[PDB]
Amino acid sequence: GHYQQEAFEARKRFEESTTYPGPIRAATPGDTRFYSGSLESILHDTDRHYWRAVTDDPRVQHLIPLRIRFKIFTWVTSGWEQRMQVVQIMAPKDSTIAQVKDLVIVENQSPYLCVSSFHLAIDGKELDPQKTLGEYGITEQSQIDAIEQNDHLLHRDDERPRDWTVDEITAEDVKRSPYKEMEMQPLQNLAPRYEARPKGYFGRTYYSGMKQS
Amino acid sequence: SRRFRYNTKFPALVSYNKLPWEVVNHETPQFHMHVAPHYEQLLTLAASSPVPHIIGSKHIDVPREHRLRLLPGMLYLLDGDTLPGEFTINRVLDPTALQYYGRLSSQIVTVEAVRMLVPDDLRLLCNCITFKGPLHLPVAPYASLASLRGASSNCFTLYHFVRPNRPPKELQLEKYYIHAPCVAPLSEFASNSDERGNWRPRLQAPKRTRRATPLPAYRPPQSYLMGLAERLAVVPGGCFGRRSLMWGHWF
Amino acid sequence: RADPLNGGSSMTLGSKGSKLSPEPHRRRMPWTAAKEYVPGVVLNARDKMVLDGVQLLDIESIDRASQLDPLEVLRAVVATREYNISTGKNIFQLASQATYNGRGQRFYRKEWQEGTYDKYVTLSAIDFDRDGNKGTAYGYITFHGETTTRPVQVDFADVPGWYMDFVEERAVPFTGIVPPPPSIGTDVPVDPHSYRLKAYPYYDAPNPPEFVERLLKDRGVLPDTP
Amino acid sequence: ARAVIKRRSPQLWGAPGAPIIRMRGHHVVWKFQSYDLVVEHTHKRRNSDIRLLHYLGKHCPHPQKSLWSPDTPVAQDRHLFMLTTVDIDAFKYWFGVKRCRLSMKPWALLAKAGLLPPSLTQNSKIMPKPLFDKESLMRYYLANRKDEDVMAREKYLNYENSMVKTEEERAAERPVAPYL
Amino acid sequence: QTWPCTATICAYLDVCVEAGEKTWAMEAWNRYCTELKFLEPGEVDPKPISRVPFSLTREELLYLPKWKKHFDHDPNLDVMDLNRFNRTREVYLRMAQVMLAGGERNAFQHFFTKLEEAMLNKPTPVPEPPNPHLVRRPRWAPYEHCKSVHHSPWRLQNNGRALALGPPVTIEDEMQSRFFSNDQFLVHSVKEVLRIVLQEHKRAHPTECTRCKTEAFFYKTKDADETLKFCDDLIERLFASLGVRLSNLNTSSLLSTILEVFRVVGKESGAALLQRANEFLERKASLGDAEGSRENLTASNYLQVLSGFADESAFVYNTKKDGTCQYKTGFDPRTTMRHLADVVQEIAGNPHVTWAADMHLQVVETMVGCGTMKANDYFVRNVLRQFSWDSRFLEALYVEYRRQDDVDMWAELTKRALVWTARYNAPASERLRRLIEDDYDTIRVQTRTFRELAVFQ
Amino acid sequence: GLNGCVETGRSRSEVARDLGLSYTRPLHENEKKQLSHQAVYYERLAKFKMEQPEAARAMERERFVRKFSGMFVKMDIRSGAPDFPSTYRRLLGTKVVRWASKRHGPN
Amino acid sequence: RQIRPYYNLPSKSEHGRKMTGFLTPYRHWMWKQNELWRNV
Amino acid sequence: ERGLYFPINHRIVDHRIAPGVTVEETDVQSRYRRELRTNFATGETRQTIAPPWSARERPTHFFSLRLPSRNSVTLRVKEMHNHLLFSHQQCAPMLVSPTKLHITLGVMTIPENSREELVKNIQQSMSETFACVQPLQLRFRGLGTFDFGRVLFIRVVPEADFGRLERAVCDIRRRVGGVLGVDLKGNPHDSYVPHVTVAKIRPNQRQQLGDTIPQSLWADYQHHDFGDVTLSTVDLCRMKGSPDGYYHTEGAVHLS
Amino acid sequence: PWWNFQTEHRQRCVLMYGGARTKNTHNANHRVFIKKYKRNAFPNRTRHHWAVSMTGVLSQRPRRMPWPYDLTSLIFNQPRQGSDKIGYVVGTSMLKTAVVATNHMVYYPKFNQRVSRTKRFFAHDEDLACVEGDLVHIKQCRKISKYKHYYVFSILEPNVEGRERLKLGLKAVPPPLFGYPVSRRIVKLN
RNA sequence: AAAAUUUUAGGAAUAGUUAAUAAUAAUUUAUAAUUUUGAUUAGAUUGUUUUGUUAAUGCUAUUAGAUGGGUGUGGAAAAAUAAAAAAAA
Ligand SMILES: [Mg+2]
Ligand SMILES: [Mg+2]
Ligand SMILES: [Mg+2]
Ligand SMILES: [Mg+2]
Fold first, then answer.
1. Which has fewest Cβ within 10 Å: B47, C28, E261, E300?
2. Is the CB of I163 under 7 A from strand J?
3. Kind and range of the H or E run holding D2
């Protein structure tokens, strides 16, 4: 927006400076890990946990915190939901999209995400695994989605998982997959104990961006 | 209610209370529900001022390789009826789905046909909408649609490529909401028109010997009502408006 | 929050209203949004005294010993139809009888046409589920000569309060596409003789005299003798 | 939001709710009974002090003879007295800035004091509640309605800033010769 | 006793200008910004941040008294380093504006001359990055769960992901003033000085620069001629100092401000404005020695043109004579509407000019004044559904309705327009509401709430 | 590099970091070994999840489903007590059998 | 509370409450009047 | 069950995301403790950073403390090399030859036209700076990285005569870059971090070798002790690997 | 009214004029100890309970109350009490963790005199600067692990001696000769 | 998230356990943590403006109220009789 081009412009015009001595690192502090509060808060690299009234020299970011969004199927106890889960890496500035995929694959802790091969895409357009972030103008503000193999097959009832509400889960598939790990047959402590949302939550029509009545 | 600051409550990995991500399914009617009122705005824009990638010629051709890094998001208008290379054809005859093109068909070009096209690999999509006849909107000379024969051979088509089962974002229609005026009502007073001398001004309000005919006497409703719509926070019709003004509800 | 009643004025609790805003007051419960509702209890409540002296059979009772005279069956059917309209007419009961399932016709519920209230629905399309009398009904709301831009699921289609009137003019075949009717301000140039506005944003109706009588005869202004 | 509602002492909207100004005292033989005007939350606990925002004052509901003043042949002044201590700055703060609520009996007090117009619940049952119709009201309104800017200026001085700067104090505050 | 940094000085001088008190600005100047310099070839850059930040050696810690070790974040410590980016030219500019504001020529001439000279002969200082604590920063969010522009199916709701309602007011499309080159800032400064001339003219004669409250609006004030002389001399001084360099920088804001001066102070009809702007752009295309291909007038300029036509046809409404309207002496609706028409043709021709609600408002008003009775049609076609609008529209339009043939049309059109206000989230203003109320005997349209009336009585 | 920053609040390890200095006492074998074993966690992990996605995915299933089982799911003042046995000692004999003593550390 | 008079729309149900708040147009009008007063 | 219910190390809020997001819309996962892992752990070091214009140009000459024969340093670095090559022989192009070991006291860009005037002047001012300073005994233990893990070096511990060094350096810094304007890659009012560069990855190499020296190699030597050394000799050098088996030396000063 | 005599009382409900509204808690109760165990077997190893126990904390006689007037508040201005402590480093067996012994003050108002007590803290020092026997400055901060809320802010006095001892490969300080006291007699010869 | 104040006449060891790594480890790494400056078990006991006596540093009272988890709702668990809190005209 405004900030992005204001700051970009500032950087560009600061690099074209003929006469500059350079900063004095005695006067340019880092950040603290020691501050009041229980929680550990991670901030921007231009921001600090103390009050610094003076504006620091624009620096170029050598690690860009990319976000990569996946579709996930959550078990909500009335059936399946499809919602969004982000992975966040720190990708070196000049890195190749191939290498970004690799970073992503190493940084997800959910067993339900990276199972098959996937392609990174911005606004639906696939990206070259061959080229740099520099060419595609990826600023960390950019919206980057992630498209799996079977994802265009989801409109069917096959690839989309089958919930024990409406479908048989058989001795075939009780020993395999999320179905196994879930423990459908109720135990005393009630099993993994997932989140539940009831049937009448959204009314008769499910959640939409457009008001349907 | 406002959205809260951060989630410190539940582990992130499990993600817990999350509004479901909305996905647009091309098999169903709902698809069109999203895409249609966009199209109309789009066409309206095309009727007034030029937009670059809207009008094009002789379809498009790309390799199998670069197919998905080029196509998705693409929207363009062609003169004739020719269906894209390598697409299985699905006719949309189902009435419900059709229904959403109502506004676009009555107050813009009449819709002759709708077509859902799916490729060999099934991973792409094309929404193909064939209009018949001239627009019911006026078209300007310097506008994009003025470069087309189908308007102003009376059939022409709109082609929209997209990926299936994606959120109603990455079909890109919102870049088109640029608003340009229809200059038709003022074209009458331009130096170009010869009916500009048949115009005569009303500078002064005419002398009034009458009052407005009093409205029909009020019949108080006979049935049972749900109570004050004010206190129930119902907008005046349950339709539109502010809950402070209770006009037009039962009283 | 968004749209209060009389701004914030807190001088009583009831001073606020029966809801604070149209929007859901907790974000975790969406359905609490302010709608316009209908008395479901009374308007379902179908009369079982029309079903007296009948002998209805059942769906899966097909047996030879089970069923009865064709005359008996006929009067049973008539008593069942009489059972279903026993309050008012459901939309899918109106629409199945009209040509083309009543596409294009204007469905108004009773209370929408009386008092200063003026509203109806131009039906876009209909789905009958296996059962009639239930289903999904889509259309364009028209409120005081103002019309919707796109179709919407018609709410409370299943509650039997509905009336409509069959006009051949409005009928549309399943081939074509139901057009949204014109909103009288914009697409059709406004005219007084064809359409006059019942009530407008700052207007409200004058006092009916007998209500006033009742209220004064209540508060004890106008006396009342047994 | 309690599973088993505490049945006897219900309230609106959960805890602790709005700040409200209440009148309360421990119950005793009527001869000695006093009340407290207290700003506090909507949901009280066992002891009223846990949620207590401020202490607005003592109120004694016993008409008193004024022995403090010298016995006065003026008729009015020898009516009995009713004694109340208001803290008016915390009142105007809590009510004005913090937007309080009000129970009814405190309202009646604050009315006798000229802080608030008399309550909703004070009824001379002599008069009835009024009637209304829009077009008569409208005739009266068309008859008298002030000018736009006069009214805007009213709303300005009442709600927004009151103290303003007339020409003279401007002229008095602007720097003189060596820096002018 | 906090030493104001340069930024602060700017802010306070902005308040000084708007207040037009030179006295404040002089004391403020004299105390704090005196020794403020410019940047020269020898001078270096943003100066680095030189402060230590404050610590204690163990002997400082142990042997000092308690107060010596007490650090509250105190300005005056970082003042030196808040000023490391050299915003001085801004201060000089504001100071010019003030000396002009308080009506003193010599001082103004001084500041503006210094500024001009330094702007031509000294390097452009490196601008400061956006301050984290004022303008914040764009934290990352996916925009996925959002209200999906067509949400309510009665209208177009704006949305966080994209803006579908079109701009309510035209924006100049220039970066923040500090990012400019030195030459560019010189230009900017002239436009600034003009803007202040205008503002001062509106503080002197508030009646004449309000649209159509008084017939006084139609005739030049004495002392306006001297003013315009000043403006002309100024602009010609800009073309005299800056040479061919002007061919390389944005004149858009400058032009729009000149046009707005010759629309407001001296009063020029729309045709005169369009002419002036074209002659100006000719001048700027010619001074640069090239093949021409002039830049077209950008959206803001056209906004000034159109409001020019709107000034042209304007009416004092409901004189106490119960006479309909008073008009600009020597007004021809035909010619006016002719020029407006071919001007809108001109605009809508050019693809790069964005339309806003205000431009449409100037147009609509020009219609209403001209007795065109097409105002409705234009409004409903080009505005109503597609913009977030004022009730100013409905004001001009009610004036239009009033002039129709029969009464029922008046009533019904007006009522319908109120329904417009209720549907389209325009909170019909008190001006409009009063304009409707005035005719109550004729049209019988109630404007007030029930509540509002009761309470009122 | 021996002093902390008073206004910044950063420790001496910090200002030493910034002046690009290292005050680090000579290390014995314990510390060198622990540290050297810690540095490499990410190489080891990277190699693991690239070369052997299955074993990884099994273990992840464990963690994920585990989060939903167990004592607390919610992280509130109770769950989020850094010292559970200490702040609730009044649970320790009867209700809570996990802990035999109220104090395992300095405080 | 919200006053439910006897001439409100009676609900016939054995599974729930005996009287739904729904109004005779008279009661609605009346309510509007009293409300106006309180607005004052 | 083996510890705290929510381990304190796992409690992390990301404020660089957004106010509403993580409550409702989506949840963001990351391994957040790679980023938090600190300057001591990674082995990073903050060197005086160059202004952009100076950042563009290559350095030409540098100041160096010359290491004598028979060092503890050179010996132990040789042992370190052997160990490293036996572990991974991919290091082989990274490693600096034990013959080229020197301490880097600061780095500098000299233009080729004014070359003679500047070497003369520098050498003179340098000789004046160190006239009073007697030899320096410095301690070397620990490793650290410059340039994002591309340059791997031995630290100079401020436990010894180092103090004097810092004054000494900070004098030439204010002469060489302050007095006669010369490009020191940093600001002359700031002090350079003295170091012994052990392994390095140059721009040309970076394609076959990789973008960062993997920390698995030098992890175990990260805190290793290379010992004490006394230094009497200061050099100003132009960078050529060829001429002596050592860097081509344009000037010298003896500390005595 | 607490100032009125036993026989002077009239109403128990109110204070007629002013003063303090007091509740008489009955201080003299003859409260007693119950003896539930034989003197031979008491169900505790260390300490035995034979009489009524005095039950307060700070209600507890003779009163010992928090004194924030010692050296630490003398040198520092603390935002919150205990946000700063000066101490000696005792032991580093835990990576990046310096244990610190620190004195604070208690006041006995009965005897009008002070005592210093001592307390241990875990301080987080990134980077392991501290050696045993350093005089350090220590601050309150973010909860770091279960027991560490303090971090090493500054070394006032390093251990020059101890560091040199380390460089040579020996421990910073010799390990204490005897451990904790015992109730046994350990006969271990040669 | 912490800091200070903590009882028993005759006094010994305590333990899902410390610290680093990290959204790891029912077998990660380490010379680990609490204690005689009185720990942990066990006894008694409702914690840091409330009383009584007294000229007075003292002595002698102060109620009551937060008792784990197991589809985790809710802004917050305080959620299973025991009000004396007007709870959407
Ligand atoms: Mg709120
Ligand atoms: Mg603790
Ligand atoms: Mg116990
Ligand atoms: Mg339980």
1. C28
2. no
3. none
